[PDB]
Every structure is written in structure tokens, then in C-alpha cells.
Amino acid sequence: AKLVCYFTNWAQYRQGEARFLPKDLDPSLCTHLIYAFAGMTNHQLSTTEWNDETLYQEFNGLKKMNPKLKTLLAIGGWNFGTQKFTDMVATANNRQTFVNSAIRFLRKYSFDGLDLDWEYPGSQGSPAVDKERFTTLVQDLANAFQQEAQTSGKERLLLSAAVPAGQTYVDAGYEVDKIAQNLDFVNLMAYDFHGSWEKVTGHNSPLYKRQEESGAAASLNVDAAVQQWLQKGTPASKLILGMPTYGRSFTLASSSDTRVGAPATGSGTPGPFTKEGGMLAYYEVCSWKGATKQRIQDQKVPYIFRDNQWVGFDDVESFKTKVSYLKQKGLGGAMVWALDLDDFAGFSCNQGRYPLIQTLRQELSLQDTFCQGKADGLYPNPRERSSFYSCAAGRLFQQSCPTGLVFSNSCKCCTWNLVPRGSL
């Protein structure tokens, strides 16, 4: 299982106890750490913060304490917008300039791969052609990453992508089946489903639909987003379920109507640290005094309200529920946005350091010719213990075992690993 955690390079600017600094990084907490963000200049990869180069060394320096730990560098995000992606992907030459710069940059700074965070191909200013050109970008990077690994001798650079949960964005920019074959893993942004852009209270990251929802709204939830990415061609083993360590906040029309779906007049009051109306870090919500917390029964996530302020957020219970679901669906693990929004310093929630992300950590720990002319049956994955190959009429399929089970040829099944006999 993977635990993919995002680092943000502007969290160093928050005040007081919310300030996230190099010491706050825990190299043992996640399996993959991703640096948000890099930007782009003249179609080449570039820093976005005056001290990025210093931060890169601290960041990848984490691998000396944990050398299982892999690191990636993310490009794009909210602030980046789209136009630079659009200009880079348009011509095969511009794409080339980027891909080469990318490889140079990542080796130069000790990153193990690249995470694409374009928001989004085919949306906002991005033209319809950017959908297929994004496929081409992903292909090119996968190509050039593969050849660098032969030539250089070292391990191939990883390639991942952070992908939207909304069908409108997915349809407009993502050829799912294609890109999924090239991406090492797929970071599903299963949050921002509801927020203060809408006129009524809604949860940021609900697990299931509410009984009363219909139309498009019925798919604005984690389960529908997961099935969407599965049905459209993503292997479960590559689908990483994003979790948010922030909630989204509303100002209610009336303090007497606090239901999910209650009229809201706009964003909730900015948090003392994040200072962005409409959202709150977990550390800003977890210890609200004199508030009333409730759980949404159908959606398995909590909300909290106090006077005219209402916030939907994720807690320890909901992260556990989401990991159960995740494993029940055979997903490749969990992704989290973001490290600096969890109570990383244990100063607020009285739950220790990283209570949300630790919850994920704990709960996560509980060819094309090969199958011919084989008979129908199961075969092991020579490169992997918890995966296997099924042959069906000459055709190969790759499946994974349930979490905490291994493939044994003796039962042609996934089962328990062999038991020790009073060993060291």
C-alpha cells in the first residue's frame, strides 16, 4: 500500500504554531512525499519559491533517515492556472524542451519522479485539444523516463498525476485508459465536492451520496468518483484515494438551520492561520470550543457548527472509514492533501502529531503472450507477492490480492503468509 503525502512550499509562511518547517517533516510517516509546487519558465521546469533549492535538499535529505522513502516534485496547482501547460503541450518541440528540462531538474535536485497537477486540461482557459495533448505529454514523459533509465543505469523516474473527481473535468481532459497505462500511480483528488461556491451547505469529501440527491449531484462523492476512475480504465492497484486534512466552511443564512443542505450566504470566516474563507485546516476545526459536531449518516463524514458557521471536514473516524473502503475496493493506497493541514505539531487537537495521517498509516498496515497457450487459471507475479496473473482464453489479466494476503501457487489463491516457529 502507498501513503502519498503532499508538502506545500508556502506553508513555511503561516504564522505561529501553524508554520510548517523542515523539522516538521517525518521521513517515516509516508511512503511517498510530493513537493508542491514547481512552475514553468519558457517551457522548462523551474522553482516557485525563493528558497526552493534549500528546501529540496532538506526534503530529499529525508531519504538518509528513510531510504525506502521516494520523493516526487509536483507541477501546476490552483495558482499556476493553465496557459503555460497549454503552450508547452501544443508543439512537439515545446513538449521536448519540457521533458528534457524535467529529467535534468529532477536528477539535479535528487527527486525520484514527477507529479502532474494541471488544473485542468480542457477546463477553464484550456482548449478541447488539450485533452489529447495531455495524453501525449504523459506518453512522452513516460517514454523519455524509460530511456533515461536504460542509459543512466539508475532507477526510472516515477510519473504520477493528481486527477479531478468531477465528471465534467474528467470528460474534458482525461483519456483515462490511455494515461493510466503510463502513470505509475494516479492521485485521485477526492475532495472539494461541495463548498461555498454553492448556495447550500455540503460536505467537502463525503463517502457516499445522500438519499435525497439526484442528477449530477448523486456522483459528487468519493465512492462515485472511485468507480468513475475504475470504470474508465484505471487499474485499482494504481488508483490512490486522496483524503483532505482540511474542511470547507459556510456562513449560514440562519443559525437555526444547520442541516446539510441548509441555505448559506457565502464562505465561512477565514481561519486564524490559513486565512482563506471557505476552508479550514483540521487543526483549526478539531478544537472549536462550544460547537456542535454531528455525522452525516449516509455519507459517513462529520460536520461541525457554531452560531452561523458550519464546516464539513474529515476526522479520525472518517479517515478509518475511507481506508476500509479503499482496501475493500483494492485501491493502491491513500493520498493526503496536505501535511501542513493535519495537526503536524500536535498543538491543537490533543491527538499527538499528525493524528489524521498517522491514522492512515496505521490503518493501511491493517505479457500479452504469457497466457498462451496456457489453460485458464491463476499464476504468480514473479515481481510481486501480493499480485497474480489470471489467464482467460489466452488473454492475460493482472489482479491484486486483498491487503495483507499473498499469492501461493499451492492453493492457486491469496492467503496468509507462512507462520514462524519461534524465530528471532
Author numbering: 22 to 387, 416 to 473
Q: What is written in the article reporting this PDB entry?
A:
Chitinases [EC 3.2.1.14] are glycoside hydrolases (GH) that catalyze the hydrolytic degradation of chitin. Chitotriosidase-1 (CHIT1) and acidic mammalian chitinase (AMCase) are the only active human chitinases. They are composed of a GH18 catalytic domain linked by a hinge to a CBM14 ChBD. CHIT1 is involved in the innate immune response against chitin-containing pathogens and is also produced by macrophages and neutrophils.
Here, we report the crystal structure of CHIT1-FL at 1.95 Å resolution, including its CBM14 domain, determined with an adapted crystallization approach combining cross-seeding and micro-seeding screening cycles. Four disconnected domains appear in the AU: two differently oriented catalytic domains (Ala22-Leu386) and two ChBDs (Asn417-Asn466), corresponding to two CHIT1-FL monomers. The hinge region, consisting of 31 residues is a Proline-rich region (9 Proline residues among 31) linking the catalytic domain to the ChBD, could not be modeled due to a lack of interpretable electron density. The observation of remarkably high B-factors for ChBDCHIT1 (from 26 Å2 to ~80 Å2) in comparison to the B-factors for CHIT1-CAT domain (~30 Å2) reinforces the idea of the high ChBD mobility mediated by the flexible hinge. The structure of the catalytic domain, which adopts the conserved (α/β)8 TIM barrel fold found in all GH18 family, is essentially the same as the already described CHIT1-CAT. The structure of ChBDCHIT1 reveals an elongated conformation (dimensions 60 x 17 x 14 Å), which is different from the globular and compact conformation of ChBDs from bacteria and plants belonging to CBM5/12 and CBM18 respectively. The ChBDCHIT1 fold consists of a distorted β-sandwich composed of two β-sheets containing three N-terminal anti-parallel β-strands (β1, β2, β3; residues 427–428, 436–440, 445–449) and two C-terminal anti-parallel β-strands (β4, β5; 455–457, 460–464). Moreover, ChBDCHIT1 contains 6 cysteine residues forming three disulfide bonds, as confirmed by our electron density map. Taken together, we propose that Trp465 plays a key role in the binding of the ChBDCHIT1 to the chitinous crystalline surface probably assisted by the presence of other aromatic residues in the core of ChBDCHIT1 that increase the overall hydrophobic character of this domain thus increasing the affinity for the crystalline chitin. One face is mostly neutral with a negatively charged spot spanning two residues (Ser439, Asp425), while the second face is highly positively charged mainly due to the presence of four basic residues (Arg444, Arg434, Lys423 and Lys461).
